[PDB]
Design a protein around this ligand. Structure first.
Ligand SMILES: CCCCCC/C=C\CCCCCCCCCC(=O)O[C@H](COC(=O)CCCCCCCCCCCCCCC)COP(=O)(O)OC[C@@H](O)CO
Ligand SMILES: CCCCCCCCCCCO[C@@H]1O[C@H](CO)[C@@H](O[C@H]2O[C@H](CO)[C@@H](O)[C@H](O)[C@H]2O)[C@H](O)[C@H]1O
Ligand SMILES: Nc1ncnc2c1ncn2[C@@H]1O[C@H](COP(=O)(O)OP(=O)(O)NP(=O)(O)O)[C@@H](O)[C@H]1O
Ligand SMILES: Nc1ncnc2c1ncn2[C@@H]1O[C@H](COP(=O)(O)OP(=O)(O)NP(=O)(O)O)[C@@H](O)[C@H]1O
Ligand SMILES: [Mg+2]
Ligand SMILES: [Mg+2]
Lengths: 490, 370, 371, 289, 371
């Protein structure tokens, strides 16, 4: 394998280009361009030997680009638009939705399909006058008009069943039936012909005009709605997504109501994260040290049991804690009342709720830190402890003078990451406390255990304006710039 | 882009989806059109995401309140059931499926809370909330209680709060007035004051949640609880000789539980709207069709008059329907999300003594309206 | 403090690395362990330190049993063979580590760290990490760290091996100065014969786990108990030629050299249990061989290797019928080359003689400086 | 003294295990209680095997006398979880290790920037990530269907991007290994690949286990992404499958708890098997110093 | 291959550990580097092998400029000072690693691993891992790994430092035979004067990053270019004592010794840049001082130290008006006590003389063994 390299490089660079031009069809241009630069970067890297180092980095970087960075950019991109449940469709889809709207412009007749040899007859029945109408023999195929004739008689053919009506529904839907009094009628259901017509008709410049009221609407691309007409004060549903410059970013700074609890929520989130990280690292590290201690005879068993809080999905565990921590019922306070004669108010009192939250998070988080430390401890050579014994060290002195300092360095980036994660630990608070108890006076409501993300999620997705994705994205980007700045300084 | 000449249906996994699939086989036999039923996780959130691009199922089944959202977003077709078809279902269920005054789904089933009681501890349940304090006192002499229900969630405490005049958003005639909110009126205070008094006199506890209340009733520790049709099979397995009846009156007026109406919507992007109409109107919404679904997993009270009259021979289902009719239809507007949180907090505040009933309901009024 | 081993044994499974060891090291005694690379010196030092378990036997320190005692509570310190420095700490911090643990008197730490860093010539390297140091600097950091602590018992494992000959002299002297001031037991492993000869009160020659011999420096030099010790103490090593016992007298053995002339000489060694016709090994140091012209017994042969050390010349001679070359040392630069004919004198009184099992017949000639 | 510390340690570990196991025992209790109840006694008053029977593939003979076959293929869901978590874990190890090696041992421009960036960009709260991913996999499916929507390939492919922390973790460990081992390797004629594979990885095996463990766990417990891409019931992972037990007004707690306990089984096993690579002293005897 | 360094400089920031180094190691030359612990011997090796960067200057191997060549492509092998054994592989696997990377026959690997292992006396240790070896065995593993690879350029960094004397001698020889068989370039760093003197075609003496002198072994011993080299080559080191120039000839310098008696001695040493009245340093080696009875110029004083090495006795004497003691060596065991008065002879032919700047007044006495 020497000339095999360039043929393998050539064969892969053939699938690439093939896949790119094939994407250029239909019209996936973002996808064809992005797929091209990525492949070219890779083919370049494995082609020339002065890019050797990048061969190790590119596969991992590529994956990170696709599934971390791309979602990151989209979220940022959507921040500059009104994308929400109110304005969720593209302009095209919204217009399309409006053009499928109909209104009943006349009579409604139950219909029947009847064979006349190898041809067909259509019958219509007017329930409100007791009159019936029957067409001459016709063949299915394309847009045709049928003059109907009032009749007192029956068709000679046996009424066609639903299976036959269905098979022929397309051709049937292209028939325009004309009553003796000159009224157009068309298929509206599998059972009926009626005067159903479009509600709106598209002009050409882009003006939608309502056929029923005669009101005219044009696309207003500032707010993302068809609005009446020079702008009238009526807006059609559904709205459509549109760019909104800095609007979502300002609203966070504009609105004094949402800003009141901010600082107090911010301090709690920081403190919640700091303490979580400290306790999980401390508990996990100490346990990792113990469970590798040569003299501990059950360590193999202890080891496994200690990580089980992480083996079970946290969802059910959190809800169970919620039960265990119940103030009046629930087995923790039943234990505390029988032993120490006290029942902590774990949901009603702020500080106690926060203590509960940190207790549960530590239970959730220590196994992660333990498993990391289990591996990292293996990097410390055993003879450092031979030297430390010859220097007069005990186990506590070994821990603080050797073990801890040799672990803090590799732990630092992991702890910083854990701080960011816990900064936005939305789910824990929602399930356990729902952010309570209530901070009294908060115009937009906040509680004492709310993280920033919880409060923010409530404003964006609850709060009564539907789901404001644009606003959520904008906030997410702001809190990123904050925790990105808090992580870079730390 | 949705596939032409077929019907994909989405329904939640706690409904009789195997039943609905058999209804689907009959439709296929009669039409040639295959019907596929799916019950994905979080279908209520997945639907608006796939529907907005023009894909998704042809028909979606969910509680009606969410359909106001989908309709506003432009994801639901306007349905065209004629006069005759509408007369086959209870008029008030049609009220649950309007958006801007137009029908946007077919009502299937009706859900509300009822009073559930232990026949052995309490052969005749109370007609009034005012009867309860005295009843708890003669039950406490035998080491039991009268009533334990979920006080943490306003869904469960609203029936009593709403009875004397409390309401979420005033319903005019197909238009919820978004700034006419009735959480701090006299009716709400009286209801919530009576609830807090039950706690004060230790007839109930402020942090009784769903699980504790359900466990207390299923083990025979309490004569009564308040809960929905979903709770019945736990009680069947407990073998507690239980009845389900109309909720107690407060100050002569009925408890007003929130009403949930399982409804079938048609996807605005479907190329098969007519097929969906025929399936929904002439196959599902018949005695035969609903029976097939009910047989798989019970629907509770149904909106189809003819089949409800057969189901209501079970006094538990009759009770559900009675409470539903005296109840408040769940509003299908976005502003309800503020209502839920604000009210949940206000009840918590009052039950725990963090605030008075007046202040707690005042502040909850203020948070919803502006 | 005193150190004592009784019937002390070590085994890695079924492989005896230390076989029944008896040593009685007195308080204030400088003892040196020597032996072939792989004989068990470090194993011994570590078993004393507590860094290695003892299969069987009894170890005592300061008249207290230590077998099951943690190394940290034994009152010892060690200069590790491989240094085992703390990589995260500087030279200063490495050196001060044991003192901080025990009782951090800041003035006393700085003072003693500066003083020890001075003699070790490490004073300009105090803020370096081990990685930013030379091999011999690291070694000295390991020395400094033990010396700063001043334990009741010093253990040193090949502690000067990577220092220049000149610096090495200065460290020999300082380890000697420190021993006489503190008067503490020091146990010191080395392959350097000068260090062993000059530092030791007592030298322990180890061989594949066993104690071959224990004694004063000159005792081991003049009067080795066996062929192994004879060939180990002294470098270049003692020469060895096979001989046969011809006749025996009451207090001196006569033997025959194997070379073609078949010359017979009387060796002043113990006769007790030595038979006629037994194959002995006769031993003579390269330093003890004489110029030919002087002595009586002459061995002649061909020169194979000449090594010019400047101060002296070392000359390897292949003698007929002998198979191992005879190494001879002579003072100053000697102009001699490969191929030349060279003869030397074999002084009877300095010839050692070893039995078939390898044990030495006690030499009866009195050498000076062995009181 | 060493006897005193050891007994106290045993005492405090047992007490600590008792505490941290208590919530999990309550889950097990939920899974053996008749009906579906989140609260009750540690030993349920009314024991039932039905939740486990259905989970294990057994039909259940209920009160009225009719047979209830298992609604869902729980064991198949479990296998799907093992597959997805196992393949993705291997992929993550393989991708982050190679990355780590470059960062730890090679010079290239914007290396410090890239590592800062990797750390920082993974901290972004992409609240709209699911919307982005759906769109990517929907298009991808038209071209490589083996890794599009409703495929395990897709779910796996999506998890392969979560490596930034693992790259930092493995890098850090590599930097504890004295470089003279790889230097000597190089002088023996070894390419950087050979030094990497034959010298460094063998001595880095503890942290490789850590990364496999952490990645397996992550994948077994993952809901949002798998739930978003997987459509067919028979392809569901267990974490996705057990969401069927959760409804707006009530949870089939018993069935959910049994599923949660089953999900801990593959994790426990992988953790046990991973211990053979978690060893001290791997570098002992290599480098004097 | 030839190795040449042209103005090689190495700086760790502001610290400079190699200054304008110019060396020229020819094809097949055995070159020994000696110098104080910390002077830069390893740094030179590491820069040649490509493990450390060159600050400025040019390195050539086999005529190719190698400054930026990767280590694997230099044709270099090294016995690391710190051994750098693969701790996860056995001795055999350590020794055969390089041959496996090249697609060598298994039989070819086993043949020449067994060969190298036998001479190094590691044959019974092939299965062991480095952790289960002694310090000196590990070192020999590191030696054998480079021996098997047979690179074009051998670097050995203090490769015998942890071996017993008897074995050191045996390894010295094998390395010497290898160089004679292969004829390839070997660069060997050592602190051991005997290795240096017996192995080297040419010795490089370093001193704080400069090359102090380069020459054949006997050239450096007899004719050190300055005081530093003179004090470094040969151990125990040369004695030094201040003297005053009284008179000069073109081919000799007359000096006055510092004793009260002002004895004057003519030395056969150049008088270039040597002024009457200037203060000089007179060097005389311990081996070169003579007994008092056979001597003209006498130095007498008080005995301070006596080291009994068996083969010889080294005697340190304090002599009035000289701060440093005089170290004297004498063959055999000599009974002397501290405080005793001792006289020795100072032979003028073997006196070195150094100017105020430390530079040697070249000796003009001809010493047998140098061209
Ligand atoms: C808030 C923290 C709460 C922790 C909760 C933990 C819950 C489990 C209960 C355990 C309680 C600890 C009891 C310790 C009893 C003594 C243990 C002992 O004596 O055993 C020691 C085990 O060490 C070891 O884990 C080290 C011994 C532990 C040191 C104590 C440190 C506690 C303070 C933690 C602070 C962490 C630093 C902050 C991190 C950001 C033996 O080590 P040695 O053999 O000497 O040397 C190390 C060997 O490698 C030598 O070859
Ligand atoms: C935390 C872990 C807990 C572990 C869960 C318990 C293990 C599952 C129980 C073992 C099987 O226990 C039970 O066996 C009986 C028959 O012996 C089965 O009964 C079934 O098969 C038998 C025939 O074999 C039929 O006669 C019977 O009508 C049918 O119900 C039942 O379906 C099964 O469920
Ligand atoms: N990374 C570094 N940074 C700064 N200085 C260093 C570094 N590495 C080595 N040194 C210094 O550079 C000088 C030479 O080191 P080195 O080449 O190892 O000396 P050496 O002659 O090999 N000593 P030895 O091995 O003790 O005989 C010493 O003074 C070291 O302290
Ligand atoms: N873990 C082990 N298993 C089996 N044998 C071992 C182990 N460790 C060391 N040995 C052997 O035990 C013997 C003694 O080792 P050691 O006590 O270090 O010798 P030493 O005298 O210090 N040699 P040196 O350091 O080379 O001067 C040697 O032959 C080793 O190879
Ligand atoms: Mg040793
Ligand atoms: Mg060196």
């Amino acid at each position: 394998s020497d000339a095999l390299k360039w043929s393998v490089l050539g064969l892969l660079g053939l699938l690439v280009g093939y896949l790119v031009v094939l994407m250029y069809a239909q019209g996936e241009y973002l996808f064809a361009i992005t797929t091209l630069i990525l492949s070219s970067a890779g083919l370049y890297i494995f082609a020339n030997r002065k890019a050797y180092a990048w061969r190790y980095v590119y596969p991992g970087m590529a994956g990170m680009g696709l599934f971390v960075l791309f979602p990151l950019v989209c979220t940022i991109a959507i921040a500059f638009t009104n994308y929400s449940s109110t304005n969720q469709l593209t302009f095209e889809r919204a217009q399309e939705v409006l053009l499928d709207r109909s209104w009943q412009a006349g009579k409604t007749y139950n219909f029947g399909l009847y064979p006349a040899g190898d041809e067909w007859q259509l019958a219509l029945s007017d329930g409100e006058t007791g009159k019936n109408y029957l067409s001459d023999a016709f063949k299915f195929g394309g847009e045709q008009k049928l003059q109907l004739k009032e009749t007192t008689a029956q068709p000679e053919g046996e009424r066609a069943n639903l299976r036959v009506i269905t098979q022929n529904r397309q051709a049937l839907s292209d028939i325009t039936a004309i009553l003796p009094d000159g009224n157009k009628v068309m298929m509206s259901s599998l059972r009926q012909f009626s005067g159903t017509q479009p509600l709106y008709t598209l002009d050409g410049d882009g003006t939608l005009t309502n056929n029923q009221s005669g009101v005219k609407y044009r696309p207003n691309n500032q707010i993302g709605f068809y609005q009446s007409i020079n702008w009238g004060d009526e807006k059609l549903s559904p709205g459509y997504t549109v760019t909104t410059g800095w609007k979502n970013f300002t609203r966070v700074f504009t609105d004094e109501g949402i800003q009141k609890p901010f600082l107090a929520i911010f301090v709690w989130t920081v403190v919640f994260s700091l303490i979580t990280v400290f306790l999980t690292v401390a508990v996990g590290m100490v346990l990792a040290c113990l469970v590798q201690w040569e003299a501990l005879r059950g360590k193999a068993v202890y080891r496994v049991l200690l990580i089980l809080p992480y083996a079970v999905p946290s969802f059910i565990s959190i809800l169970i804690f919620k039960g265990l921590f119940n103030q009046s019922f629930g087995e923790i306070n039943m234990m505390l009342s029988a032993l120490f004669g006290v029942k902590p108010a774990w949901f009603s009192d702020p500080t106690t709720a926060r203590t509960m939250l940190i207790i549960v998070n530590t239970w959730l988080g220590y196994p992660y830190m333990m498993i990391l430390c289990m591996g990292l401890l293996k990097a410390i050579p055993d003879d450092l402890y031979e030297a430390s014994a010859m220097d007069g060290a005990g186990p506590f002195q070994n821990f603080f003078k050797i073990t801890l300092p040799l672990l803090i360095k590799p732990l630092t980036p992991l702890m910083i990451a854990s701080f960011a994660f816990n900064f936005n630990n939305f789910v824990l608070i929602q399930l356990l406390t729902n952010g309570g108890p209530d901070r009294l006076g908060t115009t937009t409501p906040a509680g004492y255990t709310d993280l920033l993300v919880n409060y923010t999620y409530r404003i964006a997705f609850e709060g009564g304006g539907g789901q404001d994705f644009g606003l959520a994205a904008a906030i997410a980007t702001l809190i990123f710039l904050l925790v990105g700045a808090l992580a870079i300084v730390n | 882009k949705i596939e032409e000449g077929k019907l994909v249906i989405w329904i939640n996994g706690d409904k009789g989806y195997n039943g609905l699939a058999e209804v689907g086989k009959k439709f296929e036999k009669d039409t040639g059109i295959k019907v596929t039923v799916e019950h994905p996780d979080k279908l209520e959130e997945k639907f608006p995401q796939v529907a907005a691009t023009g894909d998704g199922p042809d028909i979606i089944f969910w509680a009606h309140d969410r359909f106001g959202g989908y309709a506003q977003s432009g994801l639901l077709a306007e349905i065209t059931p004629d006069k005759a078809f509408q007369d086959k279902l209870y008029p008030f269920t049609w009220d649950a499926v309007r958006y801007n005054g137009k029908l946007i789904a077919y009502p299937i089933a009706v859900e509300a809370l009822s009073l559930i009681y232990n026949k052995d501890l309490l052969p005749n349940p109370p007609k009034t909330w005012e009867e309860i304090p005295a009843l708890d006192k003669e039950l406490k002499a035998k080491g039991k209680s009268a009533l334990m229900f979920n006080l943490q969630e306003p869904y469960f405490t609203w029936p009593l709060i709403a009875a004397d005049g409390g309401y979420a958003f005033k319903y005019e005639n197909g238009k919820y007035d978004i700034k006419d909110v009735g959480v701090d009126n006299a009716g709400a205070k009286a209801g919530l004051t009576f609830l807090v008094d039950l706690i004060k006199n230790k007839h109930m506890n402020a942090d009784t949640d769903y699980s504790i209340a359900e466990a207390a009733f299923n083990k025979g520790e309490t004569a009564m609880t308040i809960n929905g049709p979903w709770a019945w099979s736990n009680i069947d397995t407990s073998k507690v000789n239980y009845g389900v009846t109309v909720l107690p009156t407060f100050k002569g007026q009925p408890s007003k539980p929130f009403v949930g109406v399982l409804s079938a919507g048609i996807n605005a992007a479907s190329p098969n709207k007519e097929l969906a109409k025929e399936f929904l109107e002439n196959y599902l919404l018949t005695d035969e069709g609903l029976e097939a679904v009910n047989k798989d997993k019970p629907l509770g009270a149904v909106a189809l008059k003819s089949y409800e009259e057969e189901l209501a021979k079970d006094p538990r289902i009759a009770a559900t329907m009675e409470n539903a009719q005296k109840g408040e239809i769940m509003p299908n507007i976005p502003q309800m999300s503020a209502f839920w949180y604000a009210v949940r907090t206000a009840v918590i505040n009052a039950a725990s003594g963090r605030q008075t009933v007046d202040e707690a309901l005042k502040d909850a009024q203020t948070r919803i309206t502006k | 403090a005193s150190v004592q081993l009784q019937n002390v044994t070590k085994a890695w499974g079924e492989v005896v690395v230390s076989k029944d060891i008896n040593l009685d090291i007195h308080e204030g005694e400088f003892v040196v362990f020597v032996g072939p690379s792989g004989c068990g010196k470090s194993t011994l030092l570590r078993m004393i330190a507590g860094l290695e378990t003892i299969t069987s036997g009894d170890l005592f320190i300061g008249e207290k049993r230590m077998n099951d005692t943690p190394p940290a509570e034994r009152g010892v310190g060690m200069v590790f063979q491989s240094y085992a420095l703390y990589p995260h700490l500087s030279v200063a911090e490495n050196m001060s580590f044991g003192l901080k643990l025990a009782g951090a008197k800041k003035e006393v730490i700085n003072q003693r760290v500066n003083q020890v860093a001075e003699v070790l010539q490490l004073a300009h390297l105090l803020d370096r990490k081990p990685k930013a140091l030379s091999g011999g600097q690291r070694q000295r950091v390991a020395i400094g760290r033990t010396l700063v602590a001043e334990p009741s018992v010093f253990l040193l494992d090949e502690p000067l091996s990577n220092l220049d000959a000149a610096l090495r002299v200065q460290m020999r002297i300082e380890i000697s100065r420190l021993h006489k001031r503190l008067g503490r037991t020091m146990i010191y492993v080395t392959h350097d014969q000068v260090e062993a000869m000059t530092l030791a009160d007592k030298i322990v020659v180890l061989d594949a786990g066993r104690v071959a011999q224990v004694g004063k420096p000159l005792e081991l030099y003049h009067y080795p108990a066996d062929r192994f010790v004879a060939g180990f103490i002294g470098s270049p090593k003692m020469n060895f030629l096979p001989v046969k016992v011809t006749a025996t007298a009451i207090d001196q053995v006569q033997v025959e050299l194997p070379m073609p002339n078949r010359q017979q000489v009387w060796l002043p060694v113990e006769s007790r249990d030595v038979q006629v016709g037994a194959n002995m090994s006769l031993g003579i140091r390269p330093e003890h061989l004489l110029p030919s012209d002087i002595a009586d017994v002459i061995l002649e042969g061909e020169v194979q290797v000449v090594e010019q050390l400047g101060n002296e010349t070392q000359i390897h001679i292949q003698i007929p019928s002998i198979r191992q070359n005879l190494v001879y040392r002579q003072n100053d630069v000697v102009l001699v080359e490969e191929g030349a004919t060279f003869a030397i004198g074999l002084p009877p009184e300095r010839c050692h003689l070893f039995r078939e099992d390898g044990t030495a017949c006690r030499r009866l000639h009195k050498e000076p400086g062995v009181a | 003294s060493q006897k005193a510390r050891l007994f106290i340690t045993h005492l405090l570990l047992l007490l600590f295990i008792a505490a941290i196991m208590f919530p999990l025992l309550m889950v097990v209790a939920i899974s053996l209680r008749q009906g579906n109840f989140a609260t009750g006694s540690l030993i349920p008053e009314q024991i039932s095997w039905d939740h486990w029977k259905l989970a294990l593939g057994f039909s259940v003979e209920q009160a009225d006398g009719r047979i209830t076959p298992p609604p869902f293929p729980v064991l198949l869901w479990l296998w799907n979880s093992v597959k997805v978590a196992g393949i993705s874990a291997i992929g993550i190890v393989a991708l982050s290790t190679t990355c780590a090696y470059a960062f730890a041992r090679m010079r290239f421009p914007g290396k410090a920037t890239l590592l800062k960036g990797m750390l920082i960009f993974q901290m972004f709260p992409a609240v709209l990530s699911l919307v982005a991913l759906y769109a990517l996999f929907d298009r991808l499916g038209e071209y490589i269907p083996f890794i599009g929507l409703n495929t395990h390939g897709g779910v796996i492919f999506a998890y392969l991007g979560g490596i930034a922390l693992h790259v930092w973790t493995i890098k850090g460990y590599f930097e504890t290994i004295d470089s003279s081992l790889e230097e000597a390797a190089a002088l023996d004629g070894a390419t950087p690949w050979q030094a990497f594979r034959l010298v460094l990885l063998p001595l880095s095996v503890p942290i490789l286990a850590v990364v496999f463990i952490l990645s397996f766990i992550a994948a077994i417990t993952e809901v949002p992404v798998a739930s978003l891409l997987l459509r067919d019931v028979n392809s569901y992972t267990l974490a996705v499958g057990m969401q069927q037990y959760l409804n707006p007004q009530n949870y089939l707690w018993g069935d959910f708890a049994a599923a949660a306990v089953m999900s801990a089984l593959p994790i426990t096993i992988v953790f046990l098997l991973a211990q053979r690579w978690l060893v001290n002293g791997l570098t002992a005897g290599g480098v004097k110093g």
